[PDB]
Amino acid sequence: GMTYSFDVRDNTLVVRRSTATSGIKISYREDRGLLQKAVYVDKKIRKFLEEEKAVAAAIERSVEFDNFSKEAAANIEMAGVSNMAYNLSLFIGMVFPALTTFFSAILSEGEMSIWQNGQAIMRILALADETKLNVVTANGKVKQVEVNLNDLKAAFRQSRPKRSDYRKGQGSKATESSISNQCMALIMKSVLSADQLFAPGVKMMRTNGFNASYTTLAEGANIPSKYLRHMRNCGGVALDLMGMKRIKNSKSKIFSIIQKKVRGRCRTEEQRLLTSALKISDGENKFQRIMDTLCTSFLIDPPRTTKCFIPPISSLMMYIQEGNSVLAMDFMKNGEDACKICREAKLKVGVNSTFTMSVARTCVAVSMVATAFCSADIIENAVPGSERYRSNIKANTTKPKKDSTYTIQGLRLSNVRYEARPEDRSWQVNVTDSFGGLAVFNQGAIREMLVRALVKRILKSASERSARAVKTFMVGEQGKSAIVISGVGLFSIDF
């Protein structure tokens, strides 16, 4: 050793040692003992930097990441009218009042109408179902209240629908716990999707050796495994694939189990064959070639995805507290009932310089469609006025930090909208900028105007499909309106 410092080799922060003599040699000591002489800050260094001696933000995101990754790493190992709608409405109609009642001991009325607090209630609920403190937004100010998780758990287990209350198909093995878990998976998918706005999972994909572009395949990666086990398709295909790659290196039987699950999630035949084409007895290359091809295909043709469309938690609690009934509602088919609750209740939110109103509106939008990876155009039409670029967002999290301060104002959600479930003859194939100097154009259209067999087909099919602009309808109570899904999303500007 001779000289010590802190640096960022890749996207992590490491200890850099320079020794001079036969000139200068550079070492990155992974000892992390040393730390005195000196995005991801890591545990030992964050404990030493917090104990003794931008720095606070990249560490809040870092420990957050640690939690996300632990939850994801639970889920990757575990890889080895409609009933569901009626059950989910029954579940909500029975559980939410019990949540209203429990938290009336702890929170005021106005407090439960604050967006952050609904989120907080579900997170603590999920925690109990698996005495802690709980960070609550007050009069712009953050208070820490105490929640007894046994009371919360017991209240939940008794309040929730019974096995006989649910509609189950004939000879169903489904139990009370089982269905509860399905509902919690559907609801946790919505609540947690706002976090993936702030930390999509890029780091995790990179750390597992997947191209960052495959992050869009990691929706809901942090849904608590007890719930996802029952509702695998709430989870996003990247979980299974990473499980398959990890077990490819390292037993044989598991690989077949995950493979079968992935095959079932495929919605085109091309992906099904491609999936089966992966074999535990292949070289590193050409298994990676197949895996990569498969991943890429999944960007073209998404895996089978399950989810629900519910209004904000607080809104939902208010709407039920006001006397309204959700038993006859359908949150599976589309977002209509979710929008009806949205327009009706008078949700409130805490906002500030970093977590602005347009940020909050984006967080709502994202939970309504239960995915951070949704088209930005859709997001914008779903909750008007929301922010369409992640880059313009200055906050680093949805969660109040206890030193946090807000101004509590109204989160009006009339003019909210949902996408019609589907069941473009335009001539305009390019635009210019303001100067008429630069053009953006539809590649597929421009091209028309002018194992290996698999790849060729997929590539042709892709181009054949990208040539036509994709349109979709946003539905209000006043009617229905076409928009174009451009392909731009959140995260489209880095970073």
Next chain:
Amino acid sequence: GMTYSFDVRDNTLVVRRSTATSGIKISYREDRGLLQKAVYVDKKIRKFLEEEKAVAAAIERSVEFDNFSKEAAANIEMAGVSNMAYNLSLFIGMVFPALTTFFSAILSEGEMSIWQNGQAIMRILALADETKLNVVTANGKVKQVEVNLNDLKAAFRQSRPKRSDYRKGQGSKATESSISNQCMALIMKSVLSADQLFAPGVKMMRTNGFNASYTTLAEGANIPSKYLRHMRNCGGVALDLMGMKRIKNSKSKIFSIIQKKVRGRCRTEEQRLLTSALKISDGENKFQRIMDTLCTSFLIDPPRTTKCFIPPISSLMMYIQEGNSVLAMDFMKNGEDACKICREAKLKVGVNSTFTMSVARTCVAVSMVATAFCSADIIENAVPGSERYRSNIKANTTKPKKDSTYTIQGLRLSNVRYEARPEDRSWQVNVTDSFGGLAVFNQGAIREMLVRALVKRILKSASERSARAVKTFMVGEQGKSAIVISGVGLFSIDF
């Protein structure tokens, strides 16, 4: 003959004759004498339908088209700090006050602050420079005032800057008339670009045998030829190409003149060669192949385009009437000074069920960037709240119809923005819809993840370029903000 009716064969309305006998034979009589027994309604049929006996809309658009096409057909035949900035500001600073004064005889003060009326003033001015009635918006209601065009012409010719007033390069042949015409071309490009929102020119391209997709190459086609002659590049390359095709069929010398102009408008070498490759001595095919290739290339790499960035006409008149000076302003380099005037003046507009506020905002946006073919993202950021889809627009024209009624309210233009003149490392290459069922994706990226030589190169270059998302900055006084040009524009939903 046996039976007669009206029908729409292609996109025009024709007279359909059925004769039955040896069964039934169908004829489309082009006589148009006959009309009693019975989108483009045509003259003789519109005169007969108006004189004797949805119908009114498709005919307002039809006669409008006739005017557009006549003006375009003048321009296609005629195909055979900075000075310009300072001259344009001088021109405006001297001409606009004279317009304020002239129209004070005819209009009230409040009337001149109405958007429609500024448009009307320039159109009549252009007319005079080439006693009529003039349709004016009043108190929501439309009045017809009388304008004496000789007075208007004389006032203009005397008020406008003199040859010595302008900055001209050494040994310039430029005259007073000459420069006036350059300025009128720049200003008419802005004022008239709102019409191309309503009638882009699809019909004209189709009628000349060009693919409708090439409509984006027809910006400013209806700019009065006396002005465009001096400022060809305000006009859009389709004018020259159509001239070249028309003369290809039909003298030799003209073809070379237009060819030279087109060659000069090219900004890539590929287009220059391609342009020169067109020869009057080629077969129908393979001249069309080259022409088409050239047209397509122009969608990828726009021709040289000139234009100015000015605020709405009325705004401009008000700002000058209020005492402010534009002599030191630059409307060529970008839209900064235009936005400064926008924020300052208190423009008003007449609006109604069809011509709504969001429609009016779109009409303003389009004139600010002086093109109907600009990116929708840009339009939306340029004048917030404007309508991003032509399809959602119910009006058929910017012009009050004399039977028209409005509610006159304020057209606030703070928060307006301009695109920084340029001098994306994102991992997100696809989005999903709300259901996670359908994906939209970047073709170029997906492909990377997985005479004839010319064509091949162009096609490769296209794909190479479309792979990376294009970003640009919108500038406010509070700062600068990145957006992505998605490729979606106005007209992206048909029809």
